[PDB]
């Protein structure tokens, strides 16, 4: 199984490399060659979830058989027996093993600095270039630093 | 099994080496050659967790059969029998063996020191370069030291 | 099995050697060649823990069947029978055999002494260079001594 | 089995030799060649403990089925029957055979004596050089004696 | 089995020889050649203890099923039935056969006598050189005698 | 079996010879050649004890099931039934056959007599040279006699 773990590491590294390639394909025309640096971290879960759900519909029952005895005298006896049929959904789901659980991307732009408007524009391009998903916990940093 | 433990050590060392390579790929342009030093510690758990969860939904029951006797005279007798159907989820999860449980990264920058703003900018780049995850217990130190 | 114990000793020594290599890779640029000495002790547990946990959820029961008799006359008789369904988690964990239970690192720096600020900076670099984990019981000493 | 006991003695002697090697690797630069002497005693237990623990959680029971009869007249009869489900942990542990139960290290430093501060500094280096564990019953003596 | 007893004697003699070698390795630099004499007695038990312990936890019971009848009229009848589940530890230990039950070391130092301070310093070095364990019943004598 | 008894005699004689060798190795430097004489008697038991102990813990019982009826009217009836679980240790020991049951050593020192202080110092060296154990019934005589 450790060979499987090794190949999982390979998958994660391949994903990171592909995302880096896309980042380059976007930023190389916009910024130029050597005016930026970017690295990508991709964390992938490899669990084996397998779920079975059996759901009913309480608010729409359908009476199948029914008995109702109601006699008076004073005495009032109200017996009743009822059998129901209910909407039944049975869903069996099997999640894919390796899923990107969190994605971190950081891009540093060489100074000569960059204005806030262009930094936010680059961030907007990256959002969509990488597939930024904040609800997944992903993080995207864009900074303007001084290259040596 | 000790061979398996040896290969687990190899996996941990490989992960550390990959993270060091990424750190170099980010900092070598920004800082230069020989102006920094960085080391990475990665601790990986290799447990064999395997969980089975059976969850219900108490607040939405669906009545399947029902009996209700209610007679009066004074005397008031209220018998009742009820059978329910409930939402049932059965999920079987099998966690991946080797998972990074804690990650420690330390970077030291050669003086001539570095301002706090640039130190924090480098820290921001590393956050995303390495995939910093504070909730996991990870730690990232960036210091400005005097190289000899 | 004594051969297994021998190979466990080999594993511990290999871990210590790797940590020493990382310590050198960090301190050799910062301090220089022959200006420091460091040794590492790693204690590793090799137990064979194997745990099975069966947990319930007392506060969210789901009634499956129910009987309730409540008659009056004075006399008040309140019979009741109830069956419940509960959330059931069954987790089987199998810990990895060899785990670092305690780690001790000591570093001695040659005088000409070293200021407290630089000693603490070196300690901060080592924390992350080695993966210092105080909650595990690890210990890290950094001293400034006079080499002969 | 006496051959096994012989190899256990060999293991203990090997551990002592390794610790002596580490002591030399630390003290030879600091003190010099022939300015110190140190010997190490390592006592190792070779029992075959194998434990099975079955633990419950008294304070969080989950009611599975329940009957409750409560009639009045005066006469007050309160019958009750209850079945519970409890958190159940079953852990099977198998300790490693040979474990260092006590470690004794003594170091003697040649006079021309040594000040208390440097003696304590050497003791601090050794703590971490050897992996001193007072809670285990280990003992570390550092003395300044007159070599002949 | 008498051959086994012979090899047990051999083991004891080997242990004594090793301890004598360590004593020499410590005292030869400190005192010199021919300025001391030391002999070591090691008594080793070779029993075959094999213990099984089954321990409970009286103070944390968990109720599994419960019945409680409590009627009044005057007459007060309080019936009760209760079943418990208890923490159960089952440990099977098998001690190693040959264990040092008592250790005796005596060292005699040639006069021209030795001061009490240096005698106690030599005793401190030996404590740790040999692994002195008073709780085991071990004994360590250091005397200053007149060699002929 | 008489051959076994012969080899037991051989074992006893070998033990005596080894102890005599140690006595010589200690006293030959201290006293000189031909200035002393010493003989050793070793009595060894060769029984075949084999013991099995089953021990309980009366003061920490754990109630497993319990019934308690307590009705009043006057009449006071207090019925009770209780089942307990107790700590149970089962140890099977098998003693080694040949064990030194008593040891007698006598040493005579040639006059030109010896002072009481040096006699007691020699006795202290021997205690530890031989492994004197008074609780076992061992005896150690040191006398100053006139050699012819």
Q: Is the dihedral of CA F132, F137, F138, F142 positive or negative?
A: positive
Separation between Cα atoms, residue B45 and residue C100, nearest integer Å = 11
Name all chains with 3 or more CB-CB pairs below 8 Å to chain F. Answer: E
Structure tokens at A110: 């060489």
* Residue D77 near residue E108 (C-beta atoms within 8 A): no
Q: Which helix (H) or strand (E) holds A18?
A: helix A2-31
> CA C142, CA C37: separation in Å to the nearest integer?
10
Q: In the structure encoding, which two tokens stand for residue C3, read together?
A: 């051969």
For chain F, how big is the Rg over CA atoms in Å? 30
CA distance B87 to A91: 12
Among C138, E130, C64, E81, which residue's Cα sits nearest to residue B65?
A: C64
Residue C15 with chain B: CB contacts under 8 Å: 9
Partner chains of C (3+ C-beta pairs under 8 Å): B, D
- Alpha carbon distance B49, C88 (integer Å): 16
Closest approach of chain C CAs to the CA of D104, in angstroms? 15
* Residue among E26, E35, E97 minimizing CB distance to D148: E35
Any idea of the CA torsion for C56, C57, C58, C64, to the nearest 10 degrees? Answer: -90
Between strands F76-85 and A62-72, the pairing is unpaired
**B115: burial class by Cβ within 10 Å (0-12, 13-18, 19+)?**
exposed
Dihedral over alpha carbons B124, B125, B130, B131 (to 10 degrees): 50
Q: How far apart are CA D44 and CA D9, in angstroms?
A: 9
How far is it, in rounded angstroms, from Cα E89 to Cα E53?
8
| Residue C98 CA: distances (Å) to CA of B33, E4, E91, F79 | 38, 35, 21, 55
DSSP readout, A86-145?
A: --EEEEEEE--S-EEEEEEEEEEEE-----HHHHHHHHHHHHHHT---GGGT-EEEEEEE
Is B140 in Cβ contact with C128 (below 8 Å)? Answer: yes
CB contact under 8 A, C39 and D26: yes
What is chain A's length?
A: 148
Tell me the helices (H) and strands (E) count for chain E, helix number first.
Answer: 2, 7
Q: Provide the sign of the torsion angle of the four alpha carbons A27, A28, A29, A31, taken in this order.
A: positive
Instruction: For D66, list phi and psi in degrees, rounded to 5.
Output: -155, 135
**Cα angle, residue C10 at apex, residues C5 and C12 outer, rounded to 5°:** 95
CA distance linking residue B118 with residue B108, whole number of Å: 13
Closest CA to D98 of B5, C5, E94, E51: C5
Ordered alpha helix ranges (H), chain C: 2-31, 116-129
Sheet with F36-45: strands ordered across? F36-45, F99-110, F139-145
d(CA E48, CA E37): 36
Distance between CA atoms of D37 and D146, rounded to whole angstroms?
Answer: 11
Q: Residue B34 CB: number of other CB atoms within 10 A?
A: 10
Cα B124 from Cα A143, distance rounded (Å):
8
Residue E61 to residues D61, D66, F61, F62: CA-CA distances in angstroms? 11, 20, 11, 8
Contact E129 D76 (CB under 8 A): no
Handedness of CA F127, F130, F133, F139 (dihedral sign): negative
3-state secondary structure C93-120: EECCCCEEEEEEEEEEEECCCCCHHHHH
CA separation for the pair C76, E112 (Å, rounded): 106
Across the interface, whether the CB atoms of A49 and B73 are under 8 A apart is answered no
Name the burial class of residue C93, with classes exposed (0-12), middle (13-18) and buried (19+) by CB atoms within 10 angstroms of its CB.
middle
In sequence order, what are the residues at sequence separation of 6 or more whose Cβ sits closer than 8 angstroms to the Cβ of residue E116? Answer: none
F14 touches chain E (CB under 8 A): yes
- What residue in C sits closest to B78 (Cα-Cα)? C70
| Orientation of helix A116-129 relative to helix A2-31, angle to 10° | 140
Which subunits sit against B, judged by 3+ Cβ pairs under 8 A?
Answer: A, C
Q: How was this structure determined?
A: cryo-EM
Going through chain B in order, the beta strands assigned E by DSSP cover 36-45, 50-56, 62-72, 76-85, 88-94, 99-110, 139-145
Residues in B touching C67 (Cβ below 8 Å): 80-82
Contact E37 F25 (CB under 8 A): yes
**CA atoms of A56 and E38, how far apart (whole Å):** 87
Determine the Cα angle at A113 with ends A107 and A117, to 5°. 75
Tokens 């400005």 correspond to B144
F62 to chain E: which residues are within 8 Å by CB?
Answer: 56-58, 61, 84, 86
CA distance A74 to chain B (A): 6
Q: Is the CB of A15 inside 8 Å of chain B's CB atoms? A: no
What is the rounded CA–CA span in Å between residue E20 and residue E105? 9
Q: Crossing angle of helices B2-31/A2-31, nearest 10°? A: 10
Name the minimum distance, in Å, from the CA of A101 to any CA of chain B.
12
- Give CA–CA dist D15/D103, Å, rounded: 10
- Rounded to a whole number of angstroms, the distance from the CA of B29 to the nearest CA of chain C is 19
Q: How far is CA E101 from CA B1, E20, F53, F102, in A?
A: 35, 18, 21, 16
Q: What gap in Å lies between CA E112 and CA C42, rounded to an integer?
A: 46
Of residues C86, C108, C141, nearest to D30 (C-beta): C108
| Residues whose CB falls within 8 Å of the CB of residue F65, separated by 6 or more in sequence, listed in order | E81, E82, E83, E84, F82, F83
- Measuring CA to CA, which residue among B44, E139, D73 is closest to residue C77? D73
Breaks in chain F after residues (C–N exceeding 2.5 Å): 73, 112
Contact at 8 Å (CB) between A69 and B71?
no
SS3 D32: coil
* Contact status of D128 with chain C (Cβ, < 8 Å): yes
The strand ranges marked E within D86-121 are 88-94, 99-110
Q: Long-range contacts of range D28-33, CB-CB < 8 Å, 24 or more positions apart?
A: D29/C34, D29/C37, D29/C147, D29/C148, D30/C37, D30/C108, D30/C145, D30/C146, D30/C147, D30/C148, D30/D122, D30/D125, D31/C148, D31/D109, D31/D122, D32/C148
Q: Which of C8, C17, C51 to mutate to test the interface with D (most CBs of D within 10 A)?
A: C51
Measured CA to CA, the distance from residue B40 to residue B106 in angstroms comes to 7
3-state helix, strand, coil in chain B (%, to 5): 30, 45, 25
Q: How far apart are CA F13 and CA E139, in angstroms?
A: 26
Question: Shortest Cα distance from C68 to chain D (angstroms)?
Answer: 10
The label of the residue with tokens 């630069």 reads: D29
CB of C132 closer than 8 Å to CB of B141: no
Residue C138: name the closest of B9, D61, D127 by CA. Answer: D127
Cβ proximity of C47 and D94 under 8 Å: yes
Say how far apart CA C117 and CA C123 lie, in whole Å: 10
Interatomic CA distance for residues C125 and C36, integer angstroms: 15
Strands E62-72 and E76-85: antiparallel
CA distance C107 to D115: 20
The 10 Å Cβ neighbour count of residue C118 is 16
Which residues of chain B are within 8 Å of residue C34 when distances are taken between CB atoms? none
**CA F118 to CA F132: how far, in whole Å?**
18
CB F129 within 8 A of CB E106: yes
Which regions of chain F does DSSP assign to beta strands (E)? 36-45, 50-56, 62-72, 76-85, 88-94, 99-110, 139-145
DSSP symbol at E108: E
State the Cα–Cα distance between residues A100 and A130, nearest whole angstrom: 13
Taking one residue from A and the other from B, the number of pairs with CB-CB distance under 8 angstroms is 162
Q: What is the largest CA-CA distance in chain B?
A: 102
Tokens 């059931």 belong to residue = C88
Tell me which chain D residues have a C-beta less than 8 angstroms from the C-beta of E66. 80-84
**d(Cα E140, Cα E124) in Å, to the nearest integer?**
10
Cα–Cα distances (Å) from F83 to A117, D82, F66, in that order, read 80, 20, 6
What is the three-class DSSP state of B142?
A: strand
């Amino acid at each position: 199984a450790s060979a499987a773990r090794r190949k999982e590491q390979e998958l994660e590294r391949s994903q990171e490399q592909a995302l880096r390639e896309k980042i380059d394909s976007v930023l190389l025309p916009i910024l130029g060659y050597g005016n930026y640096t970017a690295q990508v971290d991709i964390q992938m879960d490899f669990s084996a979830v397998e779920q079975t759900r059996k759901r009913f519909d309480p608010n729409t029952p359908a009476t199948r058989s029914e008995y109702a005895l109601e006699d008076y005298n004073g005495s009032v006896r109200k017996e009743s027996t009822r059998n129901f049929e209910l909407d039944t959904t049975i869903s069996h789901e099997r999640k894919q093993t390796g899923t990107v659980a969190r994605q971190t991307v950081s891009v540093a732009i060489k100074d000569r600095p960059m204005s806030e408007s262009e930094i936010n524009a680059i961030r907007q391009v990256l959002i969509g270039t990488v597939g930024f998903d904040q609800g997944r916990g992903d993080l995207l940093n864009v900074l303007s630093v001084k290259f040596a």
